[PDB]
Subunit: 416 residues, 4 copies
Amino acid sequence: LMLARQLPLKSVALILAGGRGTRLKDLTNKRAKPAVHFGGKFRIIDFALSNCINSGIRRMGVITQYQSHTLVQHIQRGWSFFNEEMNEFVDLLPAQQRYRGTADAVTQNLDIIRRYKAEYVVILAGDHIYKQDYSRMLIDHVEKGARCTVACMPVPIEEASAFGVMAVDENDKIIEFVEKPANPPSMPNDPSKSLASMGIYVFDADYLYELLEEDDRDENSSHDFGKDLIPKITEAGLAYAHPFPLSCVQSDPDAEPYWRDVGTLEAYWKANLDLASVVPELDMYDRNWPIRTYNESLPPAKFVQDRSGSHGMTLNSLVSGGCVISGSVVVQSVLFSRVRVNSFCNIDSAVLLPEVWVGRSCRLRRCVIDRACVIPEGMVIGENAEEDARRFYRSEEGIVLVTREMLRKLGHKQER
Amino acid sequence: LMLARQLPLKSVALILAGGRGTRLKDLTNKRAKPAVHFGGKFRIIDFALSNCINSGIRRMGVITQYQSHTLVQHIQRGWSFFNEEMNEFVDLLPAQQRMRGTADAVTQNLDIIRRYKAEYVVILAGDHIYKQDYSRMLIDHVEKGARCTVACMPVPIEEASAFGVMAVDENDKIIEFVEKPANPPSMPNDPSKSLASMGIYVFDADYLYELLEEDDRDENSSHDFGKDLIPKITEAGLAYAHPFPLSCVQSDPDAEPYWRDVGTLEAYWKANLDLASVVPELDMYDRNWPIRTYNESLPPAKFVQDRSGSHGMTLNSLVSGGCVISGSVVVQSVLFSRVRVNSFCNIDSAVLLPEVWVGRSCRLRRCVIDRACVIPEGMVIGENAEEDARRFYRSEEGIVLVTREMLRKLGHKQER
Amino acid sequence: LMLARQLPLKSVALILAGGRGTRLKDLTNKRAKPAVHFGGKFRIIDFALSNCINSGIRRMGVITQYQSHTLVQHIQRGWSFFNEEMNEFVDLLPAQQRMRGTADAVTQNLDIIRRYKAEYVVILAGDHIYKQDYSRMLIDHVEKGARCTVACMPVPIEEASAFGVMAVDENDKIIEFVEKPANPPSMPNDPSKSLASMGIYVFDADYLYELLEEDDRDENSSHDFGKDLIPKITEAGLAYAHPFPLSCVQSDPDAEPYWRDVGTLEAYWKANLDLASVVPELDMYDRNWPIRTYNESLPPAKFVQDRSGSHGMTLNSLVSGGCVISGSVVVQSVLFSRVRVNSFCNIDSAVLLPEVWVGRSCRLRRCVIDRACVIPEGMVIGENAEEDARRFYRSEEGIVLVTREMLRKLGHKQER
Amino acid sequence: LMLARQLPLKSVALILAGGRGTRLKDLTNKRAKPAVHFGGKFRIIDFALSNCINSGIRRMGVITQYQSHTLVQHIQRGWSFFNEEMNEFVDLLPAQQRYRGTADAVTQNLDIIRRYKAEYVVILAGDHIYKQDYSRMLIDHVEKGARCTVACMPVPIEEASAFGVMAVDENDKIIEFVEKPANPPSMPNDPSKSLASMGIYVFDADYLYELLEEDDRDENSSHDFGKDLIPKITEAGLAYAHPFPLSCVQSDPDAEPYWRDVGTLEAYWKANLDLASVVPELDMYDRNWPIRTYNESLPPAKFVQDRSGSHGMTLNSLVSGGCVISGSVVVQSVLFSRVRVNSFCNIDSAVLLPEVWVGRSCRLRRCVIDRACVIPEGMVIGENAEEDARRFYRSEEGIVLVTREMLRKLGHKQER
Ligand SMILES: O=P(O)(O)OC[C@H]1O[C@](O)(COP(=O)(O)O)[C@@H](O)[C@@H]1O
Ligand SMILES: O=P(O)(O)OC[C@H]1O[C@](O)(COP(=O)(O)O)[C@@H](O)[C@@H]1O
Ligand SMILES: O=P(O)(O)OC[C@H]1O[C@](O)(COP(=O)(O)O)[C@@H](O)[C@@H]1O
Ligand SMILES: O=P(O)(O)OC[C@H]1O[C@](O)(COP(=O)(O)O)[C@@H](O)[C@@H]1O
């Protein structure tokens, strides 16, 4: 008794929000992937932080390394609501990175982390969209009596090449850890699945420092948490597994756990339109596990009449507050804040990131419009293949990405 | 030279947010009128607070006469963003009036007001809707060498009986002030209008005090700013006027100034639907003069298909965050937060306050639904007048008010 | 397993901060006793709030019965650091009691309390000084399968008449409860002590409601938690006890638990000087259980030379920020913020509340100076008892209270 | 009229808080000079920011470039109190500097600054300790009708080699600007003084961008605001002067203006002990122009008895809140937060930065003890010259600097 409460308090989170998401290719080109928008108003680092709040861990470390001014701004504006006097804060560590990343990146700020005097460090990732409690994870880490606890999940074998694959024992003890294998070794029972890592580790902190120095001296290591550190603990035999279904926060218990690594642009589009469906897989209307963001004041989403006095028919949409839609059939889309949309437009299966200004008679289909574009009048997008692969970036699955640069290069005056 | 910015600093606002809005019969009988919702996200009082921010007066006094626990909460959550040590704050002054009109609310808390060490005090009576720049008014107050400055606007003579009417000379100096007359006098040039007050007085700091005590040691006055004090000052000739067009904040200078005495319920429906029309009179999309409110983290305005799979139509509407609409043609309406409209409904020119849950097959027309009011399936409002006057409260013009306690009569269990 | 941290989440605290501290004759006759200063920077209520934070109960209800505008302000400035949308907040509930004891303050705001959707409600009566962990108490409450848990501590029999005395069996189940007796009963093993209550009850959510209505529809009860409800529950046998040593937060486990019923003025001087001594009983330097307050930006405690150029001595004292001392030997004293002690003074065992301006050549001994009290030059306090009983209020033990209104009698103009 | 108010609103501040203060030599070695402590609780960037608040410019740009994690932390914790919805914020730009500094450093973030849409940019410095209003400066900049306005002051000729020297005209128009000359050209009237620049410029913003690009293309420039930019505007003839005495905020008007460039270690010590004097030159007890910092909750400054039962005599000291002093004569010192000082110590003319733990019988004289040292027991400092120049850094004027590294190298176990 009195364990699940006293475990977060003695613990501190380290969010590794220094990813780039190179497979998004342009969407994270001007922003760190953790600062990528998602789900109407939120960002991808609003999940990994919220999970720390609602699990009790109010001491967070946001390691913003690569191309992070908007991430600093978001963490400053929305998440600076802490009274440090009671040992709660989201400490915004800049990395000043020297390749040689994420676990050297916890090592550069090793002299700041120590001064928290924490017993259990949570090594998170801030580029994933999950919904988990770590208070149920730390209990499971301390009961087993391990030094490190990896959060693993069974994923398909065709995409398990991109995650850290592992094999566990009866008591969830790591025997064999391999990382990004070309041939993912399946689980013993199911051949179509592999028990892969999620990037959510938990160390007992006095080990962790004690480990990161042995690797800091190491000149032959990659200095990654999944390539030369956990494959070292695994040989030591002190690494245990924590099956993710035990701690995933679900609204209904009859569904598979929801952990989406955004990763690429088509998966971003899928995982951001699944909220616009009838019954979403991610329940954002939850009140026993809410997710916080930088709540900005916008006016209500305005729906006015078109230029001819007609009406706008919005089906399976996710129009957010602040927009102004004039007529314009809007299907299966997700309109972020301030997305003006003028008349006679047909928007189907689109993700319009904030402040996108769509001109008259525009027919957008299966696309992702980047922030603060000015789409001209009469521009069809997504109802052509060879012509949408030449101006904008069309992916292998049909998805289009419209950036504020691709429109400038065509000459459509994005200055506004 | 340097007087335009040193006048707000030496001034303090006194919002007399202790109205009860008696003409708002059942809408305000649970909450004080300053705490009434208007325009999706805002409340009435926000205006009279935001006009104090943008006009530089960052020291406010909210003189909340009781019936309000829901505006103490609103102030404490939204407007508790001040550093009280750099001389900027929103002092929440409980009125604690004797179980004794407006002035006797400033008198009881007159020992708390002196300690602000102010120079010009801005009496507001801020349970109205408008956009004003009070610094303009302070400049006009000091330029004239006045002791009280009343903000006067010409209004129609058929309504001037509700307000204090005044008669000024060439210098905008008050000649004749009559408070709430049965036969309002007209202007010397326009006989159809009347130069009425607006509740916005600006007094000298060291005079009001010397004037309240002299009026507080009396046993004959009603202790009201309009009936007793302003006539007392007019008798001395130290009362000057400020035409409100000079200090009104208009996005378009080709319109007429926007001051709504919201409290009628027939005018609380027209001013709330005024933001749903094609071109509104009150611009909420103005960035040089933004209005702030308590901005909680709501998910986007979700639109989905009906139970059969059809689409939803919207024409000249507002849909704030948290709303969920399924099919159900909407017209001319305004939906506040978390308004789960269900399928096959027909909403026309309605104000749906927060957390209103409209049931299936509900035809709502010219109505004002109080907050958290769970309308049942099949209910029909606004069609046959005698029915709606038999169950709900219907004003003389046609507007209907629906309250939580109003349906429990009819048996429709609420318990949201 | 996972019960230690899921009990605070499903619980809400109700601080009955509506005491008037009648034994604090003139110290609280302007401010409610929860808003009284103690220990330099803190107020009385902070304790009962901070114990709710550190114990995980981040949903509080401050049931402030009126005479308090200076604790509404304190809550709104200091403790308005919550994100109210992640289920953590300090609801400031005005009591608005009929011009009807403690329970009838929870009854009027019983329609606001249901909407929290709580499971265990923590009645506190938080106008005391202590350090407790309520989560320990909730664990002990659910382990016993109880319906109300009373926090009992043994106190001396010569004072137990002030509190409710109880008699428990081996299971800590209440046998006999007598509220504020004239002849308190003693314990079966120690005849010099009495197992008294502490005002800290923990009720089931769905029972209290069902118990308040049953007691609110009566016209015979006093509507007090000690006189009516707890005896009513004892009669059913569903009242269990919680020894307070089990849940007290002690830096040293070799001391006795620290609970001060501050209100006597002779005990508000001893408990405030207890922090000036060599080793205090209440540790304010504890980092695993910090106590928060409103922390304004004050400059350091400046010490300077006298008018002649001599030095100042301090022995066993506290000097908070903003203070300014010039020479003037200080002993055993406690100086609150902005206390400009001037030269040639001799302060011995005194409590100087904020903004006290002591004049030149002032000899202060065994006194409690109210806040902003400008003592004049040459004043002498605590030397000759009959004089201090002729001008100020002097308790039977020797302690003196000095108030702003107390000096105006004598002619010493204050107007700081 | 209506100018001094509307000028800050249309303006934005750019604080160049990227300095190192190379002449402090060790004090800024681990912190950006703007984050250097000063005056008990404050930092050097708490002035340059506060001057922006109390002058109306609530839009600030903090260009943190070099070795800034604590500066980010301070700006996040203390100065993140802004409601961006009303166009007020302290935007914390990281520079990611590529030598080639300060004016290329405003150029890297040229795409963020534009999006404010500001009319007048204030180019401040965050390494100086002044107290000025820029609302009186912008009026003086717009009346003259200049494109740039330099804040200049007459300083001595023996230290005018380290500032930008200039010569003005009758209408304060720059004729000749030279920068860090080896022979400072004096003023025409006074030969012992030179009219030097302060680093506080004001541009009309549409010029500024229009200028920074012409210099961004320039491959032969130093990219500094005082070496190849203002010496260019001066040739253009569009640079005017704003004598600092016109806008310096003084408590009393009979004193010379107070602008201290900390710069070196002896000037740091002088300018930080001048607050501990009887009548300081910098009035920090001002209420019409306060200075904000990260107000942390500490207990009052405790003064206890020594180990033998003696008393501590503090003369002309500035003991801050949080300390614990035991006996120990303390003269002319400045004790920052949490500075424990044990018994029998003699502290004369010292600056003890936060958390310094001084051991028993320590005799410190004319020194600056860096943050979080652990000074051992019996260690004399400053009462020897040849022995204080060999362990610690002794300056040419006698001042000593004790760092947490110089003590480790002696072997005194700074880990704590
Ligand atoms: O190429 P540009 O001109 O920077 O435009 C790209 C847009 O993306 C942004 O960087 C948005 O990034 P965020 O993800 O931080 O919102 C804007 O600054 C800018 O308008
Ligand atoms: O009096 P009833 O019938 O219980 O209804 C009360 C409802 O009205 C309200 O008092 C309206 O108050 P708010 O302005 O705070 O929303 C709500 O608190 C509650 O939902
Ligand atoms: O009633 P008096 O004589 O005017 O004295 C009032 C003083 O006491 C107080 O009411 C004490 O209240 P606080 O607890 O808010 O400090 C002060 O507001 C004021 O300084
Ligand atoms: O050499 P160390 O171990 O970093 O110690 C130097 C000290 O200075 C600090 O960097 C303080 O810097 P700040 O100026 O930001 O307070 C501490 O982190 C540290 O204790």
